[PDB]
Amino acid sequence: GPLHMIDYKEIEVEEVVGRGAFGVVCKAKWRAKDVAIKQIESESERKAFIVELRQLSRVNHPNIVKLYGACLNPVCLVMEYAEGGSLYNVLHGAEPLPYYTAAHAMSWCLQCSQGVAYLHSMQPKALIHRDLKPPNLLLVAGGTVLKICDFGTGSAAWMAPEVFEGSNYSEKCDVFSWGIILWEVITRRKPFDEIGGPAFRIMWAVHNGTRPPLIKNLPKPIESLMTRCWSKDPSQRPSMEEIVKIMTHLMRYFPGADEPLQYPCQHSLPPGEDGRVEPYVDFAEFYRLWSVDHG
Numbered sequence: 034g035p036l037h038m039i040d041y042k043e044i045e046v047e048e049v050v051g052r053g054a055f056g057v058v059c060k061a062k063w064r065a066k067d068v069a070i071k072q073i074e075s076e077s078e079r080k081a082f083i084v085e086l087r088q089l090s091r092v093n094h095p096n097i098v099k100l101y102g103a104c105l106n107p108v109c110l111v112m113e114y115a116e117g118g119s120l121y122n123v124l125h126g127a128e129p130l131p132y133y134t135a136a137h138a139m140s141w142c143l144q145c146s147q148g149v150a151y152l153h154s155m156q157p158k159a160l161i162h163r164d165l166k167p168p169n170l171l172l173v174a175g176g177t178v179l180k181i182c183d184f185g186t187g188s189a190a191w192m193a194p195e196v197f198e199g200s201n202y203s204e205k206c207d208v209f210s211w212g213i214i215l216w217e218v219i220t221r222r223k224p225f226d227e228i229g230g231p232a233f234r235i236m237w238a239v240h241n242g243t244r245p246p247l248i249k250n251l252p253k254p255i256e257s258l259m260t261r262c263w264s265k266d267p268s269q270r271p272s273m274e275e276i277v278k279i280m281t282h283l284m285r286y287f288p289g290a291d292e293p294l295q296y297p298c299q300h301s302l303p304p305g306e307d308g309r310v311e312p313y314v315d316f317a318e319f320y321r322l323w324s325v326d327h328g
């Protein structure tokens with residue numbers, strides 16, 4: 034994949050937007066375009082930069098961030114800027130938070146799965162992301178388009194049990210993360226927020242078979258897919274190609290996914306009545322459109 038060698042003098046650094054897995058991300062300008070720059074912190078991070086640069090150049094897909102080029106003094110990546118920020122901020126960030134619909138929730142998960150399915154179908158060997166979570170999912174086009182970034186080649190809430198076991202893992206670990214993200218956008222809750230302390234407490238819980246609470250009034254095909262994705266045995270989880278197909282076909286019953294995020298939302302989180310939670314999104318329209326198609 035062809036890419037530019039950037040002269041640092043052509044870069045005009047504006048403001049710091051965030052701090053990813055490694056390095057610092059900053060808003061900037063380069064040749065009229067609005068860009069984002071991931072810059073090195075410690076000289077030790079150099080190995081991670083070679084990996085991410087090797088991979089981002091190799092990949093080309095609408096749901097994975099564009100790499101425009103790389104500057105080597107100082108060593109930094111020049112990528113496309115995501116105007117809407119991360120999904121984590123949209124979900125759980127500072128007030129005021131945007132209102133979103135079930136349609137948005139489904140579309141975000143579809144676009145995410147589409148990007149991952151592409152990664153799993155690389156030649157000659159598949160790419161495993163290893164770090165799928167809302168902080169690494171970015172939003173553009175008024176919140177309607179999702180991009181994947183921060184390749185994994187505080188993540189315990191999304192991590193498959195075989196990964197933190199140090200055990201042998203396949204691309205099916207990405208599928209587990211996707212299941213958690215799906216639960217997360219439907220409920221607008223932080224997964225395992227009730228479990229306090231440090232990371233090992235989550236890891237212990239998930240290792241015993243602790244999963245997120247089931248959702249009240251959730252459509253059985255969605256529930257079926259969600260719980261399949263978070264199976265202990267990686268074999269019992271569906272492939273991403275299957276997920277992409279299912280989610281594409283469900284979008285028939287979720288119109289309006291192309292409406293930009295623009296409405297305010299004052300969000301208070303109720304407690305879980307039984308062992309279940311109420312969704313943030315509403316499924317009344319789904320059931321209406323479904324019954325119209327089915328008998």
Ligand SMILES: COc1cc(C(=O)NCCCN2CCN(C)CC2)ccc1NC(=O)c1csc2c(=O)[nH]cnc12
Binds near residue numbers: 050053071115116171
């Ligand atoms: C997560 O990083 C971002 C935050 C905000 C963001 O939230 N914007 C700044 C908020 C401005 N505030 C100021 C205060 N005001 C009251 C509200 C608006 C906007 C854009 C980001 N990232 C990228 O474009 C990006 C491109 S590639 C890449 C990567 O590999 N890793 C992490 N990020 C990126």
